[PDB]
Design an enzyme around this catalytic site. Structure first.
Site, PDB file in Angstrom:
ATOM      1  CB  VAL A   1      -1.005  -0.041   1.170  1.00  0.00           C
ATOM      2  CG1 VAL A   1      -1.709   1.298   1.315  1.00  0.00           C
ATOM      3  CG2 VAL A   1      -2.053  -1.112   0.871  1.00  0.00           C
ATOM      4  N   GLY A   2       2.165   1.019  -0.356  1.00  0.00           N
ATOM      5  CA  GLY A   2       3.193   2.048  -0.507  1.00  0.00           C
ATOM      6  C   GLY A   2       4.122   2.633   0.562  1.00  0.00           C
ATOM      7  CB  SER A   3       4.323   5.146   2.461  1.00  0.00           C
ATOM      8  OG  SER A   3       3.566   4.011   2.794  1.00  0.00           O
ATOM      9  N   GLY A   4       7.186   6.121   1.110  1.00  0.00           N
ATOM     10  CA  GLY A   4       8.587   6.506   1.254  1.00  0.00           C
ATOM     11  C   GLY A   4       9.663   6.003   2.252  1.00  0.00           C
ATOM     12  CB  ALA A   5      12.498   8.033   3.584  1.00  0.00           C
ATOM     13  CE1 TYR A   6       5.026   6.847   6.108  1.00  0.00           C
ATOM     14  CE2 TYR A   6       5.927   4.729   5.398  1.00  0.00           C
ATOM     15  CZ  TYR A   6       4.850   5.614   5.498  1.00  0.00           C
ATOM     16  OH  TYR A   6       3.576   5.227   5.074  1.00  0.00           O
TER      17      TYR A   6
ATOM     18  CB  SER B   1       7.590  -0.244   2.199  1.00  0.00           C
ATOM     19  OG  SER B   1       8.433  -1.312   2.574  1.00  0.00           O
TER      20      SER B   1
ATOM     21  CE  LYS C   1       5.213   2.917   9.471  1.00  0.00           C
ATOM     22  NZ  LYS C   1       5.577   3.834  10.603  1.00  0.00           N
TER      23      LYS C   1
ATOM     24  CG  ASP D   1       1.251   8.637   9.931  1.00  0.00           C
ATOM     25  OD1 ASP D   1       0.348   7.765   9.919  1.00  0.00           O
ATOM     26  OD2 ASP D   1       2.297   8.567   9.253  1.00  0.00           O
TER      27      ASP D   1
END
Lengths: 8, 343
Positions: free
Chosen positions: B27-32, B34, B50, B165
Site C-alpha cells: 500500500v506504498g510509502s517513502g523513507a519511513y 514501506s 509496516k 501518524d
C-alpha cells in the site's frame, strides 16, 4: 454520526 | 510464544512475517519504511503492516525507532491508533535487524470523506469532537502530536475517527498549512495548543470547503494568518524567543483581528465561536482539548464520564545518551515485552 461512503 | 514465519519478496523488499498475516499487498510509502495491507487471520480484520526503514542506521535512527515504539505501545484510546502487534523474525538480539508494526489500516482519511459527500453540521460536530477527545487523552500524557492534518485522520462508514501518524522528528505545501505559526517560524518552545491550532484549521475547512491558510511559503502563510487573527501584541512579543523573529514582527504593519462572523458567514454560531477560541495567536490563550469538549458546539456528544485521560508516559529516555546498540537493545526489549490488546 453517520453513513459515509468511503471510496469514490 | 514464537509464531511460524514465512518470507516473500514483494515490490522487491523481503517481508518475513508470522503466518497469521495473509494476502499482503503493497500500500506504498517513502523513507519511513514501506507498508502492506494484509488480512489478520487472528482477528479477521484488515490491518496495515509496516516494515521499518532501517531502524538502526545511526544513533539518531535507533532513537527515533525507540521513540515510535514507546509511543505506539502507550496509545490506547478509541480515537487514537494503537499497536495491534509488533514483531521481528530475529531469533535473538544478536541478529535483531528488522522491526514490523501492525496497526489500523486506514480505509479513508478526512479528505477522502470530503471528496465522496457533503458533510452536514452534525458530521462536523462528531468529527471534531472525536479529534478533541483523542487529543485530550494525548495531551494528558504530555504528548504533542505536532502534525495534525486531514491526511493524518482516519474515518470510517460510521464516522468514527482515529488520529494517526504522530510527528516524531527531533527534526506551497499541505503540512505547513495546518501548523501553528510559532512552530512554522520556530518562535518559541511551543506547547500542546499547537495541535489545537491544527484542529481550528481543519474545522474551518470542513465548514467552508476551503483551506484556511494555504500560503505558498512561510511568509505568505504568516501573512494570511496575521490577516485573520491580527498582529502580535506586546504580551506575545516578549514570549517570542528569537530576537530576529521579534524584529521581523515589528516591521509588519499592524493589523486588527478580523470578526470571524464575517469570515464564516452562515456557519453555526457555536462553531464560529469555537474557531475564535482555537485560532488565537498566543498559544497560552488558546482553548485546550479538555475545555473544547465542554463547548456548547459539542452539547449533543460531550460526556465527561466518557472522555478518558492517559496513563503516565515516561519520556526521560529523551535525555539519555546511548550507543546505537543500546538503543537497539532497548528497542528489542520493547518488542519482547509487547502485550497484544484483548480479543
Amino acid at each position: 454520526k453517520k453513513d459515509l461512503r468511503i471510496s469514490c | 510464544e514464537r509464531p511460524t514465519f514465512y518470507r516473500q519478496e514483494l515490490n522487491k523488499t523481503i517481508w518475513e512475517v508470522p503466518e497469521r498475516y495473509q494476502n499482503l499487498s503493497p500500500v506504498g510509502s517513502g523513507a519511513y519504511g514501506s507498508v502492506c495491507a494484509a488480512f489478520d487471520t487472528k482477528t479477521g480484520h484488515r490491518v496495515a503492516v509496516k516494515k521499518l526503514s532501517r531502524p538502526f542506521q545511526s544513533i539518531i535512527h535507533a532513537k527515533r525507532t525507540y521513540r515510535e515504539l514507546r509511543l505506539l505501545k502507550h496509545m490506547k484510546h478509541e480515537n487514537v491508533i494503537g499497536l495491534l502487534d509488533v514483531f521481528t523474525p530475529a531469533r535473538s538480539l544478536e541478529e535483531f535487524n528488522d522491526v514490523y508494526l501492525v496497526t489500523h489500516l486506514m480505509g479513508a482519511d478526512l479528505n477522502n470523506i470530503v471528496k465522496c459527500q457533503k458533510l452536514t453540521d452534525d458530521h462536523v460536530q462528531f468529527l471534531i469532537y472525536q479529534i478533541l477527545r483523542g487529543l485530550k487523552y494525548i495531551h494528558s500524557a504530555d504528548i504533542i502530536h505536532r502534525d495534525l492534518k486531514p491526511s493524518n485522520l482516519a474515518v470510517n462508514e460510521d464516522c468514527e475517527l482515529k488520529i494517526l501518524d504522530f510527528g516524531l522528528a527531533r527534526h506551497y505545501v499541505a503540512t505547513r498549512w495546518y501548523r501553528a505559526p510559532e512552530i512554522m517560524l520556530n518562535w518559541m518552545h511551543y506547547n500542546q495548543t499547537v495541535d489545537i491550532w491544527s484542529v481550528g484549521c481543519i474545522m474551518a475547512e470542513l465548514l467552508t470547503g476551503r483551506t484556511l491558510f494555504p500560503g505558498t511559503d512561510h511568509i505568505d502563510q504568516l501573512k494570511l494568518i496575521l490577516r485573520l487573527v491580527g498582529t502580535p501584541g506586546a504580551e506575545l512579543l516578549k514570549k517570542i524567543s528569537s530576537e530576529s523573529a521579534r524584529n521581523y514582527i515589528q516591521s509588519l504593519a499592524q493589523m486588527p483581528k478580523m470578526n470571524f462572523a464575517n469570515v464564516f458567514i452562515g456557519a453555526n454560531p457555536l462553531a464560529v465561536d469555537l474557531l475564535e477560541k482555537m485560532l488565537v495567536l498566543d498559544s497560552d490563550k488558546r482553548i485546550t482539548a479538555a475545555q473544547a469538549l465542554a463547548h456548547a458546539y459539542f452539547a449533543q456528544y460531550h460526556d465527561p464520564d466518557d472522555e478518558p485521560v492517559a496513563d503516565p508516559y515516561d519520556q526521560s529516555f529523551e535525555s539519555r545518551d546511548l550507543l546505537i546498540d543500546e538503543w537497539k537493545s532497548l528497542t528489542y526489549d520493547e518488542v519482547i515485552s509487547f502485550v497484544p490488546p484483548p480479543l
